[PDB]
Amino acid sequence: NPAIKRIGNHITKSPEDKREYRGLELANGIKVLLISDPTTDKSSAALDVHIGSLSDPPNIAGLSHFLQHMLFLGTKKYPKENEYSQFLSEHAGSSNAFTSGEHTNYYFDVSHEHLEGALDRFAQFFLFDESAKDREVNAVDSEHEKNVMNDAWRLFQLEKATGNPKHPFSKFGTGNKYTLETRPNQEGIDVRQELLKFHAYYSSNLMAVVVLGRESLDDLTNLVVKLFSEVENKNVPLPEFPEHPFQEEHLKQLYKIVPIKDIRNLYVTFPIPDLQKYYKSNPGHYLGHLIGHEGPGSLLSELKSKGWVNTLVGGQKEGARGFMFFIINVDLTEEGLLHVEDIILHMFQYIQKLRAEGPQEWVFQELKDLNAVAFRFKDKERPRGYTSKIAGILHYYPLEEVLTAEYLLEEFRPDLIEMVLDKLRPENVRVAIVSKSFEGKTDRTEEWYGTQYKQEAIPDEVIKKWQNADLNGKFKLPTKNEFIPTNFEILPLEKEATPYPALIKDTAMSKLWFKQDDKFFLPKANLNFEFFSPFAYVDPLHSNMAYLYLELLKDSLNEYAYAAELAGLSYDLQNTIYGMYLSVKGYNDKQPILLKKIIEKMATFEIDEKRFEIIKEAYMRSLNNFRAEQPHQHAMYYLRLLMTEVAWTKDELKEALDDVTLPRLKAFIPQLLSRLHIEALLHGNITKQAALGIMQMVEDTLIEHAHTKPLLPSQLVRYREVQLPDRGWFVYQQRNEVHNNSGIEIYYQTDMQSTSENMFLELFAQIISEPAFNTLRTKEQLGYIVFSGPRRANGIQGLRFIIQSEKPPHYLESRVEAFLITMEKSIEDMTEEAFQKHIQALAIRRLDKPKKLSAESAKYWGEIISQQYNFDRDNTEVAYLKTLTKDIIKFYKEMLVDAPRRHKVSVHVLAQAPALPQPEVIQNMTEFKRGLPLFPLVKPH
Amino acid sequence: GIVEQCCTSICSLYQLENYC
Amino acid sequence: EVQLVESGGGLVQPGGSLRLSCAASGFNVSSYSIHWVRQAPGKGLEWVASISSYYGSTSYADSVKGRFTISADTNTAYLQMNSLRAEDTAVYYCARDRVMYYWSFSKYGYPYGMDYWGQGTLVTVSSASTKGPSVFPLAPTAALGCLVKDYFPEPVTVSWNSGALTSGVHTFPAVLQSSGLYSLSSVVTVPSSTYICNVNHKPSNTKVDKKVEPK
Amino acid sequence: MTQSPSSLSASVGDRVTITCRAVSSAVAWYQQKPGKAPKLLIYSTSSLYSGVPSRFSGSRSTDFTLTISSLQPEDFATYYCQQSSPSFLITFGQGTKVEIKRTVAAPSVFIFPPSDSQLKSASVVCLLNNFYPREAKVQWKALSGNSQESVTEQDSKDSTYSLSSTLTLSKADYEKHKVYCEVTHQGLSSPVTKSFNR
Ligand SMILES: [Zn+2]
């Protein structure tokens, strides 16, 4: 081919990966990767630019972000604004894009039988209406306004602004209405001309595309060649920044920051050269592995034993092509905030220990083999994120090593590691403390976020104490990981294998569901367990004691379980309104041992009083910090409280938290473990006799050490959902004391969860999805967060709209109703071919098979918690979905303005439309629930 | 224990219609 | 394809100067370290100097501190010799490190390999007079060869029939005569069934061909 | 720092071990052919360089050992061990020369009178083509203090030495005699004497 400059030899992939690959480079400089998978249900594609926001003009901050926002609103060949997202929505696809300081990555997925139909327009994106600009400015401004009160954003932009102001690293990457609209209009700047002249940097020599589909590599080749050979090449050099943004006057500095949430954090930063070109060794991943370690003899073990720190993170943080950072961030207790100097001193003592011992080839080899195993048995990723990631990393690595570069280490060089250790010195350190105790003691304000902070010079006396750091006996190198898996044998599929989970055990003690892996065949396993006990959610006191018990358990087992978590065997342990939930996922080789240890700590728990006080104070800080959550999250929380029969508010939990005492908890743990039910789901590379052996092991341990007795069936009480009256409208109103934005959630309730109602609600939500996005966000520009979809809980379902905007919730609500009438007219005037097109799009949406094991076990567990046990739900409900006709009109007239069974409840969080009735304001949730009926429970299978 | 994939605030997907 | 080329060696009076050039090809000297290692006549190898262009580091041997000066231009290496004694006569080679961005300032030594080398340039330090070679044929299951008796200095390159004869060619090492010159001979065994030897001296620029005939 | 031994002799296919004894706890290994540039053999004390035969093995006991289990006739060279050191230092050893031991061969004796153009400004040249070992005795006739001798290196295929003897004489002293090569070797029952006249 003349339009292909070169073709890669072969793509180094995993032997377990069945997908085909073919890399090539076109004549215009685009780095193309092709992935053929004849079995995928949805195809995907992604194009990555390497410019980003660090190349923004100094007078227009956020221009690349605004451009990424703008490329979706139509092109020359296709001028309509939402024809792209409407095409993807009508063909069971989605799209998105992000913009990092050195990247601008666009990505999308769609059904496998319209890949070219979508990819043509996606290519038109890279081959500007005034009204669309003036409208999208408000969307960017609502995005930044959404990111104003976010602590990570505040500290991020503050770290950008505390460096050299003349360096592009200090630029504001998001942008807002001032920098995009107000300031350019005041300075006579034509933002549209700036978009056209910027779209001099969008050259083909700095673009990397990745396409994944069912078609053959030759068809994908001819397609990408045809649609991308016409991209003009301008030979734009890749931007580099050899000068580090942090100069001497910015080093050895202390920054006192006041956060929004009541958090206590410590940030240590070391400027380092760009280590990207050292991807074959990854000394930042090595030093991060050693410093951030949590096992015995680590830094976090000492910081925890001294009662100063609870969690520690340390490693390499990416900066740009010319500069990078090496950060160590920790959380602070009330005592650790006063001993920050001692914490940093211990940090430099651990670093000095690493400089004294030197590099460790056995540690490097252990990381190499571990990463090789984790890469070989890596789960099959989702097409959109996979193509986006590969497209993002194509600029850094050759075509043959693009799949294995960030994962496989090959050469061990200690000169680099010793050099970075030479860079980790007190003369090149930056310290930032974040605490509320600095309130009123700050003198500086950040420009973009209004962050209050103070800047001081670190005393040369303290720097000298750091320079004379001796060797600490409490800091030792980690030992050999005893959780490294060595048995990858796939157990043969039993003859009694079932495509869906089967009930192989049903006793009064436990109920065991089991399924042998017959689709992925990977040496992994997911072991889910739910412990039912009425004392878990009987009152806020016992719920707080349960969360404190689980948190103390995980905190005590963190140091021991960090090696298994590093060996690809992780676990999650969280409390639920029905009892505890424990999940152990990963390699089944050494899974039963660690699981046995976790049960042993469940039944032999000894509470430390210091850990109890620290963790209790942390939970108090969490319940206090819920007031700083985002308005839409507060709306979902309030709607949850209103709809659920029994629910304790975080104010009740916070008030009852002070009454929790150590004798009460020590008397509460055996009271909880005295009467239990167990519902398990074992799904992985294990056999039936192995699953029965593990379950019987757990039961025998719980009985032996905890004397656990089964529960009575009459005590299996599930919660009902509040039933709204016909033609009834209720509005609950609260205020957000942190964010200056308003939130709103409208919820219409349906009858119950049956096949017909499920397909009605899902089909209608499929029809109104893209029109909801486009009407409420693209055209009217109400806010940045506009969502609409089905809501299911307690076996009852409904339709929900969730909007975060500046405008008042009553106006937002009236516009929602007017949009409902608009969709009524649209469906009444809709053609049968478009209706059947939504039917097919929803069918492809629902019949999408899971890509990895954890997703399938998550679907099974989702069918277990609901106690419906409908494993064949997709086939039956889609088979009924293809038989529906434009029923939907009667459903809209029955459930959704003058419907005889309209059930509407609105949540308003304070910062032509039809006439709406007078809503009943909710004064008290308890009276609200007492005055209204409750829905029945879904019958079991 | 080690800086992970996009632990900062840089990842700004245009619209959030994939969360919850 | 990566390779190195040395150029600049020759004859110099004791106390003179010279600049050796290690032109690199196939890579970027900015991202690699260059080493200079000489070999004395009849002795083992001996490291002379080293340089890391990225970190701007230089390294000299204890034998020469204020007489040698290493440097590099970004894509050629340069080794400067400002005062050569009669003991610095040797064959100078330049090589590169196999790994990228090797760190010079270290406490522990990490001996990596020097994958690619060059043919090297020989430098001799004497007050003798440069002379051209003198070819003399030798007349004879048969064996015949040519002889170079008077030439200075080293080395010479002998190739049979424009480099077409690659079988049975035995060229003997050079030996110093009592006059102050070098001498060597080159023989070859051929069957009883024309043959011309080609001698090339480069320090003095001389290329002489001569045929060999029996009787 | 130090290398052992100074020189070594072994047969074809024989096992040869070279002990280099040296801060740095590793070493590198190089093979320099006679006259040509050195060639990298072993960079890290464990692994070997790409494209190097598997018969070369780097080991460490303090003291490092280069191991050649199967010795090929094309491995005749001088082996040097390189040691890197702080302050960006590189050091070598005196090297180890490996001599190949084959069966005894027979020197093909030839003699060459001086060319006619050489007497215009004479040198008689006796020649031994292929023989083993290098210990041989060449004398000229009545003997002898102005005789020059030069030996080549071991061949890569035959592994046989070749000897060149040069007897330089002025034209006047050359015309003073008429009968002009006594060779004594290991594979010679009687010392061959090749001569020529005027
Ligand atoms: Zn965005």
Side-chain angles (χ1 to χ4, degrees), chain A residues 810-847:
Chain A
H810 61 87
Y811 177 83
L812 270 42
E813 201 158 19
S814 61
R815 293 310 304 173
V816 162
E817 209 76 15
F819 172 80
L820 293 179
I821 302 181
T822 304
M823 289 309 298
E824 173 185 19
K825 299 177 58 60
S826 177
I827 297 178
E828 290 179 16
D829 297 331
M830 182 174 297
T831 62
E832 199 74 20
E833 185 55 24
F835 185 81
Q836 197 69 23
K837 182 184 306 179
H838 289 88
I839 284 182
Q840 177 66 20
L842 188 150
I844 297 297
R845 195 85 64 182
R846 292 294 309 276
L847 290 179

Short mmCIF file of all heavy atoms in Angstrom, two decimals, chain A residues 810-847:
data_model
loop_
_atom_site.label_atom_id
_atom_site.label_comp_id
_atom_site.label_asym_id
_atom_site.label_seq_id
_atom_site.Cartn_x
_atom_site.Cartn_y
_atom_site.Cartn_z
N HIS A 810 -36.75 24.35 41.04
CA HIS A 810 -38.11 24.42 40.50
C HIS A 810 -38.09 24.71 39.01
O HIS A 810 -38.86 24.11 38.24
CB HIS A 810 -38.92 25.48 41.25
CG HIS A 810 -38.36 26.86 41.16
ND1 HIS A 810 -38.67 27.72 40.12
CD2 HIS A 810 -37.53 27.55 41.98
CE1 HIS A 810 -38.04 28.86 40.30
NE2 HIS A 810 -37.35 28.79 41.42
N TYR A 811 -37.21 25.61 38.57
CA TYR A 811 -37.04 25.85 37.14
C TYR A 811 -36.52 24.60 36.44
O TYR A 811 -37.02 24.21 35.37
CB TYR A 811 -36.10 27.03 36.91
CG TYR A 811 -35.81 27.31 35.45
CD1 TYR A 811 -36.69 28.06 34.68
CD2 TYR A 811 -34.66 26.83 34.84
CE1 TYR A 811 -36.44 28.32 33.34
CE2 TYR A 811 -34.39 27.08 33.51
CZ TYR A 811 -35.29 27.83 32.76
OH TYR A 811 -35.03 28.08 31.44
N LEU A 812 -35.52 23.94 37.04
CA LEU A 812 -35.03 22.69 36.46
C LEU A 812 -36.15 21.67 36.34
O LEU A 812 -36.23 20.93 35.34
CB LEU A 812 -33.88 22.14 37.31
CG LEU A 812 -32.45 22.56 36.95
CD1 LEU A 812 -32.37 24.03 36.60
CD2 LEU A 812 -31.50 22.22 38.09
N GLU A 813 -37.05 21.62 37.33
CA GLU A 813 -38.14 20.66 37.32
C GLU A 813 -39.15 20.97 36.23
O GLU A 813 -39.60 20.07 35.51
CB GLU A 813 -38.81 20.65 38.70
CG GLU A 813 -39.61 19.40 39.01
CD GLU A 813 -39.80 19.22 40.50
OE1 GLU A 813 -39.62 20.21 41.25
OE2 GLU A 813 -40.11 18.10 40.94
N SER A 814 -39.52 22.25 36.09
CA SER A 814 -40.44 22.64 35.02
C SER A 814 -39.86 22.31 33.65
O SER A 814 -40.57 21.81 32.77
CB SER A 814 -40.76 24.13 35.13
OG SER A 814 -39.58 24.91 35.00
N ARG A 815 -38.56 22.56 33.46
CA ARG A 815 -37.93 22.19 32.20
C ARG A 815 -37.91 20.68 32.00
O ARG A 815 -38.00 20.20 30.87
CB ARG A 815 -36.51 22.76 32.12
CG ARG A 815 -36.46 24.27 32.06
CD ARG A 815 -37.40 24.81 30.98
NE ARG A 815 -37.12 24.23 29.67
CZ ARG A 815 -37.87 24.44 28.59
NH1 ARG A 815 -38.95 25.21 28.66
NH2 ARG A 815 -37.55 23.87 27.44
N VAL A 816 -37.81 19.91 33.09
CA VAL A 816 -37.89 18.46 32.98
C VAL A 816 -39.27 18.03 32.50
O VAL A 816 -39.39 17.16 31.63
CB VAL A 816 -37.52 17.79 34.33
CG1 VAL A 816 -38.02 16.35 34.36
CG2 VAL A 816 -36.02 17.84 34.55
N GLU A 817 -40.32 18.64 33.05
CA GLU A 817 -41.68 18.29 32.63
C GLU A 817 -41.91 18.66 31.17
O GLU A 817 -42.46 17.86 30.39
CB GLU A 817 -42.70 18.98 33.53
CG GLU A 817 -44.01 18.23 33.69
CD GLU A 817 -43.89 17.04 34.62
OE1 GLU A 817 -42.89 16.96 35.36
OE2 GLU A 817 -44.80 16.18 34.61
N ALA A 818 -41.51 19.87 30.78
CA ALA A 818 -41.64 20.27 29.38
C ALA A 818 -40.87 19.32 28.46
O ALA A 818 -41.33 19.01 27.36
CB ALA A 818 -41.14 21.71 29.20
N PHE A 819 -39.71 18.85 28.92
CA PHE A 819 -38.99 17.84 28.15
C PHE A 819 -39.77 16.53 28.09
O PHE A 819 -39.68 15.81 27.08
CB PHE A 819 -37.60 17.60 28.76
CG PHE A 819 -36.87 16.43 28.16
CD1 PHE A 819 -36.23 16.56 26.94
CD2 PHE A 819 -36.84 15.21 28.81
CE1 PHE A 819 -35.56 15.49 26.39
CE2 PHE A 819 -36.17 14.14 28.26
CZ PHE A 819 -35.53 14.28 27.04
N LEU A 820 -40.52 16.20 29.14
CA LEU A 820 -41.35 14.99 29.10
C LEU A 820 -42.44 15.10 28.05
O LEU A 820 -42.70 14.14 27.31
CB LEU A 820 -41.95 14.72 30.48
CG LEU A 820 -40.98 14.33 31.59
CD1 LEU A 820 -41.73 14.12 32.90
CD2 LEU A 820 -40.19 13.09 31.22
N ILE A 821 -43.09 16.27 27.96
CA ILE A 821 -44.09 16.46 26.91
C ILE A 821 -43.43 16.42 25.53
O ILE A 821 -43.96 15.82 24.59
CB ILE A 821 -44.85 17.79 27.13
CG1 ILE A 821 -45.53 17.78 28.49
CG2 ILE A 821 -45.87 18.01 26.02
CD1 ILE A 821 -46.32 19.04 28.78
N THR A 822 -42.25 17.03 25.41
CA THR A 822 -41.52 17.00 24.14
C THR A 822 -41.21 15.57 23.72
O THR A 822 -41.32 15.23 22.53
CB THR A 822 -40.23 17.81 24.26
OG1 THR A 822 -40.53 19.15 24.67
CG2 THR A 822 -39.49 17.85 22.93
N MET A 823 -40.84 14.71 24.67
CA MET A 823 -40.58 13.31 24.33
C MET A 823 -41.86 12.55 24.05
O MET A 823 -41.84 11.58 23.28
CB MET A 823 -39.79 12.63 25.45
CG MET A 823 -38.36 13.10 25.55
SD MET A 823 -37.51 13.04 23.97
CE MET A 823 -37.58 11.29 23.60
N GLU A 824 -42.98 12.96 24.66
CA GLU A 824 -44.26 12.38 24.28
C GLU A 824 -44.56 12.64 22.81
O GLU A 824 -44.89 11.72 22.06
CB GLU A 824 -45.37 12.93 25.17
CG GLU A 824 -46.77 12.51 24.74
CD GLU A 824 -47.86 13.17 25.55
OE1 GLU A 824 -47.59 14.21 26.19
OE2 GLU A 824 -49.00 12.66 25.56
N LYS A 825 -44.43 13.90 22.39
CA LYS A 825 -44.66 14.23 20.98
C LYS A 825 -43.65 13.54 20.08
O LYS A 825 -43.98 13.11 18.97
CB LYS A 825 -44.61 15.74 20.79
CG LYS A 825 -45.66 16.51 21.58
CD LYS A 825 -45.51 18.01 21.40
CE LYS A 825 -45.62 18.40 19.93
NZ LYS A 825 -46.93 18.01 19.35
N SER A 826 -42.40 13.41 20.55
CA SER A 826 -41.37 12.78 19.73
C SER A 826 -41.64 11.30 19.52
O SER A 826 -41.44 10.77 18.42
CB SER A 826 -39.99 12.99 20.37
OG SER A 826 -38.98 12.33 19.63
N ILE A 827 -42.09 10.60 20.57
CA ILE A 827 -42.39 9.18 20.43
C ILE A 827 -43.66 8.98 19.61
O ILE A 827 -43.76 8.05 18.81
CB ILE A 827 -42.49 8.51 21.82
CG1 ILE A 827 -41.15 8.59 22.54
CG2 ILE A 827 -42.93 7.06 21.69
CD1 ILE A 827 -41.17 8.00 23.93
N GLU A 828 -44.66 9.86 19.80
CA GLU A 828 -45.87 9.76 19.00
C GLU A 828 -45.60 10.01 17.52
O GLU A 828 -46.24 9.40 16.66
CB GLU A 828 -46.93 10.74 19.52
CG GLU A 828 -47.52 10.37 20.86
CD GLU A 828 -48.53 11.38 21.36
OE1 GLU A 828 -49.00 12.20 20.54
OE2 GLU A 828 -48.86 11.36 22.56
N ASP A 829 -44.64 10.88 17.21
CA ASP A 829 -44.25 11.14 15.83
C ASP A 829 -43.07 10.30 15.38
O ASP A 829 -42.56 10.51 14.27
CB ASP A 829 -43.92 12.63 15.65
CG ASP A 829 -45.12 13.52 15.90
OD1 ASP A 829 -46.26 13.07 15.68
OD2 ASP A 829 -44.92 14.68 16.32
N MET A 830 -42.63 9.34 16.19
CA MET A 830 -41.47 8.52 15.86
C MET A 830 -41.88 7.38 14.94
O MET A 830 -42.98 6.82 15.06
CB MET A 830 -40.82 7.98 17.12
CG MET A 830 -39.57 7.15 16.88
SD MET A 830 -38.72 6.67 18.40
CE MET A 830 -38.27 8.28 19.05
N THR A 831 -40.99 7.03 14.02
CA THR A 831 -41.26 5.96 13.06
C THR A 831 -40.97 4.59 13.68
O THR A 831 -40.18 4.45 14.62
CB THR A 831 -40.42 6.15 11.80
OG1 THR A 831 -39.03 6.08 12.12
CG2 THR A 831 -40.72 7.50 11.16
N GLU A 832 -41.63 3.58 13.12
CA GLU A 832 -41.47 2.22 13.62
C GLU A 832 -40.05 1.71 13.42
O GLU A 832 -39.58 0.86 14.18
CB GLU A 832 -42.47 1.28 12.94
CG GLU A 832 -42.72 -0.02 13.68
CD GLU A 832 -43.58 0.17 14.92
OE1 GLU A 832 -44.28 1.20 15.01
OE2 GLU A 832 -43.55 -0.71 15.80
N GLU A 833 -39.35 2.21 12.40
CA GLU A 833 -37.97 1.80 12.17
C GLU A 833 -37.04 2.37 13.24
O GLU A 833 -36.09 1.71 13.66
CB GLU A 833 -37.51 2.21 10.77
CG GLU A 833 -36.13 1.71 10.40
CD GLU A 833 -35.99 0.21 10.53
OE1 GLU A 833 -37.02 -0.49 10.46
OE2 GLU A 833 -34.85 -0.27 10.71
N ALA A 834 -37.29 3.61 13.67
CA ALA A 834 -36.51 4.18 14.76
C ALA A 834 -36.85 3.51 16.09
O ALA A 834 -35.97 3.29 16.92
CB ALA A 834 -36.74 5.69 14.84
N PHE A 835 -38.13 3.19 16.29
CA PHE A 835 -38.52 2.47 17.50
C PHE A 835 -37.83 1.11 17.58
O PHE A 835 -37.25 0.75 18.60
CB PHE A 835 -40.04 2.31 17.54
CG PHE A 835 -40.56 1.68 18.80
CD1 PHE A 835 -40.73 2.43 19.94
CD2 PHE A 835 -40.88 0.33 18.83
CE1 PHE A 835 -41.21 1.86 21.10
CE2 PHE A 835 -41.36 -0.25 19.99
CZ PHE A 835 -41.52 0.51 21.13
N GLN A 836 -37.88 0.34 16.48
CA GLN A 836 -37.16 -0.92 16.43
C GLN A 836 -35.65 -0.73 16.50
O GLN A 836 -34.94 -1.64 16.92
CB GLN A 836 -37.54 -1.69 15.16
CG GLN A 836 -37.18 -3.17 15.19
CD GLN A 836 -38.03 -3.95 16.18
OE1 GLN A 836 -39.14 -3.53 16.53
NE2 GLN A 836 -37.52 -5.08 16.63
N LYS A 837 -35.16 0.45 16.10
CA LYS A 837 -33.74 0.74 16.25
C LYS A 837 -33.37 0.89 17.72
O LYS A 837 -32.31 0.42 18.16
CB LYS A 837 -33.37 2.00 15.47
CG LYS A 837 -31.90 2.37 15.53
CD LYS A 837 -31.64 3.69 14.82
CE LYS A 837 -32.17 3.67 13.40
NZ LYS A 837 -31.94 4.96 12.70
N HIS A 838 -34.23 1.55 18.51
CA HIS A 838 -34.02 1.58 19.95
C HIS A 838 -34.18 0.20 20.57
O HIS A 838 -33.48 -0.12 21.54
CB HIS A 838 -34.98 2.57 20.60
CG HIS A 838 -34.67 4.01 20.31
ND1 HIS A 838 -35.17 4.66 19.20
CD2 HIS A 838 -33.92 4.91 20.97
CE1 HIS A 838 -34.73 5.91 19.20
NE2 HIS A 838 -33.97 6.09 20.26
N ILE A 839 -35.07 -0.62 20.02
CA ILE A 839 -35.22 -2.00 20.50
C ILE A 839 -33.92 -2.77 20.30
O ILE A 839 -33.45 -3.48 21.20
CB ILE A 839 -36.41 -2.68 19.80
CG1 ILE A 839 -37.73 -2.20 20.39
CG2 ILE A 839 -36.29 -4.20 19.89
CD1 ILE A 839 -38.95 -2.86 19.78
N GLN A 840 -33.33 -2.65 19.11
CA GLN A 840 -32.08 -3.36 18.83
C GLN A 840 -30.93 -2.81 19.65
O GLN A 840 -30.09 -3.57 20.15
CB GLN A 840 -31.76 -3.28 17.33
CG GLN A 840 -30.44 -3.93 16.94
CD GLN A 840 -30.44 -5.44 17.14
OE1 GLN A 840 -31.50 -6.07 17.23
NE2 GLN A 840 -29.25 -6.02 17.21
N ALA A 841 -30.86 -1.48 19.81
CA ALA A 841 -29.81 -0.88 20.62
C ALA A 841 -29.89 -1.36 22.06
O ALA A 841 -28.86 -1.68 22.68
CB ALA A 841 -29.89 0.64 20.55
N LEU A 842 -31.10 -1.43 22.62
CA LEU A 842 -31.25 -1.93 23.98
C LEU A 842 -30.94 -3.42 24.07
O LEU A 842 -30.37 -3.88 25.06
CB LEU A 842 -32.66 -1.64 24.50
CG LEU A 842 -32.93 -1.92 25.98
CD1 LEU A 842 -33.98 -0.97 26.48
CD2 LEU A 842 -33.38 -3.36 26.23
N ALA A 843 -31.31 -4.18 23.04
CA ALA A 843 -31.01 -5.61 23.04
C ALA A 843 -29.51 -5.85 23.05
O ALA A 843 -29.01 -6.71 23.80
CB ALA A 843 -31.66 -6.29 21.83
N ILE A 844 -28.76 -5.11 22.23
CA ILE A 844 -27.31 -5.20 22.26
C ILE A 844 -26.76 -4.71 23.59
O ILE A 844 -25.76 -5.24 24.09
CB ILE A 844 -26.71 -4.43 21.07
CG1 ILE A 844 -27.17 -5.04 19.75
CG2 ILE A 844 -25.19 -4.41 21.14
CD1 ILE A 844 -26.70 -6.46 19.54
N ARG A 845 -27.41 -3.71 24.19
CA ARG A 845 -26.95 -3.20 25.48
C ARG A 845 -27.08 -4.26 26.58
O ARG A 845 -26.17 -4.42 27.40
CB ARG A 845 -27.74 -1.95 25.86
CG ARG A 845 -27.13 -1.13 26.98
CD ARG A 845 -26.08 -0.17 26.45
NE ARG A 845 -26.66 0.83 25.55
CZ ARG A 845 -25.96 1.76 24.91
NH1 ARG A 845 -24.64 1.83 25.07
NH2 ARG A 845 -26.57 2.62 24.11
N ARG A 846 -28.20 -4.98 26.60
CA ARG A 846 -28.50 -5.95 27.64
C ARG A 846 -27.86 -7.31 27.42
O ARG A 846 -27.59 -8.02 28.39
CB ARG A 846 -30.01 -6.13 27.78
CG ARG A 846 -30.76 -4.93 28.32
CD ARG A 846 -30.35 -4.66 29.76
NE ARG A 846 -30.44 -5.85 30.59
CZ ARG A 846 -31.55 -6.28 31.18
NH1 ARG A 846 -32.69 -5.63 31.01
NH2 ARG A 846 -31.52 -7.37 31.94
N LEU A 847 -27.63 -7.70 26.16
CA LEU A 847 -27.03 -8.98 25.84
C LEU A 847 -25.51 -8.90 25.77
O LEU A 847 -24.87 -9.79 25.20
CB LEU A 847 -27.61 -9.53 24.54
CG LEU A 847 -29.07 -10.00 24.59
CD1 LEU A 847 -29.51 -10.50 23.23
CD2 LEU A 847 -29.30 -11.06 25.67
#
